[PDB]
Amino acid sequence: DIIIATKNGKVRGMQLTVFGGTVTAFLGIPYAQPPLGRLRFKKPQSLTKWSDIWNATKYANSCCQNIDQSFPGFHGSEMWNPNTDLSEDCLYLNVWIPAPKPKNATVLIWIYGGGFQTGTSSLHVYDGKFLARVERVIVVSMNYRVGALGFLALPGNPEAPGNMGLFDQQLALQWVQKNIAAFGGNPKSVTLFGESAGAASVSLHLLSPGSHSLFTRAILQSGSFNAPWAVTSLYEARNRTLNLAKLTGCSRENETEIIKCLRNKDPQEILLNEAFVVPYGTPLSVNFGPTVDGDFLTDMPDILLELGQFKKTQILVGVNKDEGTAFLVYGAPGFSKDNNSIITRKEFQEGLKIFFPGVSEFGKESILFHYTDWVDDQRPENYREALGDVVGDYNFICPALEFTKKFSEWGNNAFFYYFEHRSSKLPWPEWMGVMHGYEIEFVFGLPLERRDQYTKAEEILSRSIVKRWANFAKYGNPQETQNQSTSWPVFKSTEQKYLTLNTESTRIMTKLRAQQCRFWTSFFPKV
Ligand SMILES: *[C@@H]1O[C@H](CO[C@@H]2O[C@@H](C)[C@@H](O)[C@@H](O)[C@@H]2O)[C@@H](O[C@@H]2O[C@H](CO)[C@@H](O)[C@H](O)[C@H]2NC(C)=O)[C@H](O)[C@H]1NC(C)=O
Ligand SMILES: *[C@@H]1O[C@H](CO[C@@H]2O[C@@H](C)[C@@H](O)[C@@H](O)[C@@H]2O)[C@@H](O[C@@H]2O[C@H](CO)[C@@H](O)[C@H](O)[C@H]2NC(C)=O)[C@H](O)[C@H]1NC(C)=O
Ligand SMILES: *[C@@H]1O[C@H](CO[C@@H]2O[C@@H](C)[C@@H](O)[C@@H](O)[C@@H]2O)[C@@H](O[C@@H]2O[C@H](CO)[C@@H](O)[C@H](O)[C@H]2NC(C)=O)[C@H](O)[C@H]1NC(C)=O
Ligand SMILES: O=C(CC(c1ccccc1)c1ccccc1)NC[C@@H](O)CNCC1CCCCC1
Ligand SMILES: *[C@@H]1O[C@H](CO)[C@@H](O)[C@H](O)[C@H]1NC(C)=O
Ligand SMILES: *[C@@H]1O[C@H](CO)[C@@H](O)[C@H](O)[C@H]1NC(C)=O
Ligand SMILES: *[C@@H]1O[C@H](CO)[C@@H](O)[C@H](O)[C@H]1NC(C)=O
Ligand SMILES: [Cl-]
Ligand code: NA
Numbered sequence: 001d002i003i004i005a006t007k008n009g010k011v012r013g014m015q016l017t018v019f020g021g022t023v024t025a026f027l028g029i030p031y032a033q034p035p036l037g038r039l040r041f042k043k044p045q046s047l048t049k050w051s052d053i054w055n056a057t058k059y060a061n062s063c064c065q066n067i068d069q070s071f072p073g074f075h076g077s078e079m080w081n082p083n084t085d086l087s088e089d090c091l092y093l094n095v096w097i098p099a100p101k102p103k104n105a106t107v108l109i110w111i112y113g114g115g116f117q118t119g120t121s122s123l124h125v126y127d128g129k130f131l132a133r134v135e136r137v138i139v140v141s142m143n144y145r146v147g148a149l150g151f152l153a154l155p156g157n158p159e160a161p162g163n164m165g166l167f168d169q170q171l172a173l174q175w176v177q178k179n180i181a182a183f184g185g186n187p188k189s190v191t192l193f194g195e196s197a198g199a200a201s202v203s204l205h206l207l208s209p210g211s212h213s214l215f216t217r218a219i220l221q222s223g224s225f226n227a228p229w230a231v232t233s234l235y236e237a238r239n240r241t242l243n244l245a246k247l248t249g250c251s252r253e254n255e256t257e258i259i260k261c262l263r264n265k266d267p268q269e270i271l272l273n274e275a276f277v278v279p280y281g282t283p284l285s286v287n288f289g290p291t292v293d294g295d296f297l298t299d300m301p302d303i304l305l306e307l308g309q310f311k312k313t314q315i316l317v318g319v320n321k322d323e324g325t326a327f328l329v330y331g332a333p334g335f336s337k338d339n340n341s342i343i344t345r346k347e348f349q350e351g352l353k354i355f356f357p358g359v360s361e362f363g364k365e366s367i368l369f370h371y372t373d374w375v376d377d378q379r380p381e382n383y384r385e386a387l388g389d390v391v392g393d394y395n396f397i398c399p400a401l402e403f404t405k406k407f408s409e410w411g412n413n414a415f416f417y418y419f420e421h422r423s424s425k426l427p428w429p430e431w432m433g434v435m436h437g438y439e440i441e442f443v444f445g446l447p448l449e450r451r452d453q454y455t456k457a458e459e460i461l462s463r464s465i466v467k468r469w470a471n472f473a474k475y476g477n478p479q480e481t482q483n484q485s486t487s488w489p490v491f492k493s494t495e496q497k498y499l500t501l502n503t504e505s506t507r508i509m510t511k512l513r514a515q516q517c518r519f520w521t522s523f524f525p526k527v
Contacts, residue, residue, distance in 0.1 A: 002101075006179045009050035014057045015099065018133040019448070022099035025129060026183075027122075028060035031175040032091040032168065035145065040263045041152055041160040043167045044091060060092035061085050062120035063145050064267045066274065070330065076337065076427035080437075082120045088149065088267060093142035093172050094121060096128035097183050102136055106189040106474045107180055109215065110141035111169055113196025113223065113437070116289040117147045117274070130445030134463075135470035138185040140176055144168035148244060148270050151288035152262075153237035159259040162237060163296040166208070169201055170296070173214035191217040191473035193316075195440055199223025200230040200290075203403065206310045208296045217476055219316040219469065221443070222323060222396055222436060224403035225301045229284045229395060237291045240277040247273040280357050283327040284395055305403070308410040314476040316469070317404045317491070318417030318498075322433030324392030327355075329432075332387060340431055341384050345372075348383035355391055363527035370519050384431065389516070394524075396436070398517040405493050414491040415478050416498035418512060424455050439501075443469060457503035465501060 002024050003012045013026040032044035039045060062082035071077045098105065110126055112119040121141035128139025144150060144165040153162030177187045192202045192215050199220040205211035206218055207225070225231060232240070241258075245251050248269055250261035262270065277287050292300050304310060328335045332351045334343040343351070352364045371386040401416070408414040419439040422430075426438055441447065447454035447462035454462075464480050468488065472478035478488050486506045489497045496511045 003053060004182050006182055008047050010053045011056045012053050013095075013097075016129050018129050021133055023129040023132045024097045024099055024101075026056040026095040026097075027058055028092045029054065029056045029095065030060075030091065031093050031142065031172050034089040034091060035149075035164075036088050038263065040088070040149065041164065041259060042158070043161065043164060044171045056094075059084050059094070059122035060143065061087035061090045062122065063090035063143055064088055064149055064271060065114070065118045065146050066271055068118070071337065074337075074427070079125065079427075080114070080118070080123070082118075083122050083124075084120065086267075090143050090145070091168055091171075093140060093175065094128065095180075095183055096132040096139045097185070098132050098136045098138070101184040102138070103184060104186040104189075105136060105138045105184055106191065106470070107138045107140055107176060107185040107187070108469075108473050109173065109176060109190060109192050110139065111144075111192060111194030111198035111201045112141070113194065113198040114146060115229070115284075116151055116165065116197045116286050119146055119197070125441045125444060125446065127444060127446075130448055131466065131470070134445055134448060134466060137470055137473060138180065138183060140172070140180070142169060142172035144172075147274050148288045149267065151232075151290065152241055152244070153232070153234070153288075153291045153293065154241055154255050154259065155234055155237065155291060155293055157255055157259070159256050160241070160262075161295060162291040162293040166201065166204060166290060166296050169205070170208070170211055170214065173205075173211060177214055188216065189474065190215045191219060193219035193221065193443075193469070194223070195221040195437060196223045197230070197286075197289075200225050200227060204290060204297065204301065206313075206315075206407075207301050207304045209298065210296060212311050217314050217316075217473065219472065220318075220400065220403070221439065222319050222400070224317070224400050225290070226305065226403050227395060227399040229286045230290065230399075231301060232286065232289045232291050234291055240287060243277040244270070244273055247276055282355055282357060283330040283332075284355070284391075305406050310407065310410075312410065312412055314413045314415075314472070315404070315407060316415050316417070316472050316478055317400055318419060318501075319397045319400050320434045320436060320439055321418065321420040322388060322392060323396040323436050324390065325388040325432040326428075326436045327391050327395075328388055335384075337429055337432070340381075340429075342380050343383045343387070345383055348387050351387045352390070360527055363524070366519075366524070366527065370516070381431070388433075393513055393516045394520050397513050398520040401496075401512060401517055402521050404491050405496070408491055409493050413476065415472070415488055416491040416496075416512070417488075418498055418500045418509070419502075420500055421458075421461060421502045424458060425453065455503075461501065461503050464506075
């Protein structure tokens with residue numbers, strides 16, 4: 001038996017058998033007063049100490065959220081839905097520590113994605129035991145409030161200031177600082193890493209002064225705050241809030257009176273209305289997300305980035321080959337996970353109307369013109385592939401490249417990756433390629449388990465990525481130094497070198513999506 005004394009009370013863990021060794025796991029440690037009753041929509045509050053032994057032996061509740069439902073019984077979408085009860089009582093975190101207790105281990109903290117509306121840390125693909133076992137790092141992950149209960153904003157009004165989920169994350173970073181030593185971790189070697197909306201969270205911690213001292217380094221997988229979906233303007237945050245207050249019968253004049261009305265509604269009353277606070281959405285709609293609150297974010301983050309106002313440290317940044325395709329089956333016409341989704345030129349034009357609803361007719365012709373310079377005119381997948389690339393280049397790749405250029409221009413080492421391996425167990429059809437979210441299982445080392453029917457090539461690749469990520473955490477340099485690997489060069493503005501990850505041959509390339517990204521980053525803003 002292992003029991004650890006944390007600054008708030010004793011916690012009891014459990015021991016897991018991994019790869020013929022042992023990992024000690026502490027699942028569901030509370031790290032904040034439960035945000036219930038009058039605490040709804042507030043920043044997380046400090047935890048009251050307990051005298052007993054807390055039995056952190058099962059994953060805790062996941063924060064309230066809407067469950068994905070487009071494909072009932074389909075593992076491709078259900079692997080992402082929560083696997084514990086939904087409750088507002090959900091501010092818990094998990095800790096995996098090597099066996100035996102390490103002396104001064106580097107800590108990796110995971111922040112999951114889910115478009116700031118969904119997510120939970122108990123997903124199978126976020127299991128930190130393999131990293132603990134294989135690399136002797138400590139893995140920490142936390143749950144944070146999502147959707148309206150996590151990001152509803154009437155800015156200035158402390159009854160609902162916005163960024164609550166971000167502050168949840170922050171409080172858990174504070175917990176690791178205050179307690180990870182007791183578990184044998186080094187609070188001075190802490191690396192945030194997250195994917196998608198989690199990677200945008202990580203990026204906002206680089207800007208938040210409150211977070212500057214809570215971590216060492218940062219890994220952004222398929223996400224950054226400069227992505228078009230990542231920050232809600234204060235105008236939209238208030239229209240979205242008033243709309244939700246109308247939809248629930250909570251419109252009052254005194255803005256503080258609205259919040260107490262919203263606090264009396266049931267979580268499902270709010271959750272059911274979240275979809276309609278936007279009149280016309282897109283599949284990338286983030287109805288309740290980060291805002292410039294003047295607390296976590298002291299100014300519009302793009303100004304902070306451009307004027308070097310962020311934590312100076314190393315970053316690891318990267319994207320997947322086919323980021324956009326996932327969104328194509330959540331709304332684009334003629335697309336389906338059950339057929340090859342060959343679409344015509346007309347269907348592609350309505351696809352753009354879906355993803356760019358408020359963009360001029362001239363804007364849409366420019367996208368079309370930029371993305372229909374056929375290598376082979378006769379290829380009938382042409383429009384299908386072009387539409388996924390539009391959505392992927394615009395929503396993930398180009399913003400991550402622009403983030404890495406601007407960040408590295410202030411002198412810190414940056415490393416960029418292009419993940420282009422399609423998991424042999426990927427349940428979505430082949431036309432969807434190397435989708436959003438399906439490098440995570442490689443980062444967490446799931447293919448290291450030989451019983452899981454990943455290929456041998458996948459064991460090698462995951463083993464190399466795990467070593468690169470751990471080396472980045474431990475030493476701020478993502479090399480694999482022992483197995484004649486390709487050396488991973490720094491991303492410099494005036495060359496823009498990146499590393500491709502795959503099974504066949506890891507190579508160095510330059511200026512990824514150069515022409516696409518000039519279009520989206522420089523020209524398209526003018527339309
Ligand atoms: C655990 O290790 C720290 C040092 O961690 C390293 O330095 C960090 C800045 C960061 O770069 C990490 O990735 C590194 O692994 C020890 O901290 C030192 O403690 C002495 C004690 O007198 C103090 O004088 C130093 O200023 C501290 N900082 C450094 C940088 O040396 C810490 O003592 C170690 N603790 C245990 C229990 O092993
Ligand atoms: C700001 O919000 C208003 C109100 O939104 C409407 O009411 C909400 C409760 C919710 O049900 C939304 O989906 C509604 O659309 C928006 O004004 C509406 O815009 C639509 C556009 O199709 C129009 O048909 C309605 O008549 C408008 N209703 C009112 C009362 O003005 C407005 O567009 C939002 N501003 C944005 C999104 O920039
Ligand atoms: C690919 O499928 C889409 C979606 O159709 C659904 O899935 C199919 C596998 C099959 O089960 C259909 O019966 C389902 O409706 C097809 O697009 C639909 O086309 C019909 C008729 O043209 C139209 O009424 C629907 O609104 C369309 N729905 C969507 C989401 O586009 C598409 O034609 C199929 N493409 C190919 C190449 O087979
Ligand atoms: O995952 C989200 C939000 C997210 C997104 C939405 C639809 C399709 C794909 C991803 C997102 C929205 C906006 C900006 C970035 C990411 N919601 C809960 C729910 O739908 C689950 N997701 C869908 C799957 C589809 C394949 C892999 C990714 C996850
Ligand atoms: C914690 O778990 C141990 C072992 O299963 C059990 O004996 C003990 O009663 C539990 N304590 C509490 C407070 O649940
Ligand atoms: C709104 O309510 C709060 C709390 O009751 C009060 O302090 C504030 O003065 C009220 N504002 C207005 C404009 O009535
Ligand atoms: C390097 O290669 C050996 C076998 O040749 C393998 O067992 C080991 O896990 C590899 N390490 C990494 C980090 O790829
Ligand atoms: Cl054509
Ligand atoms: Na390429």
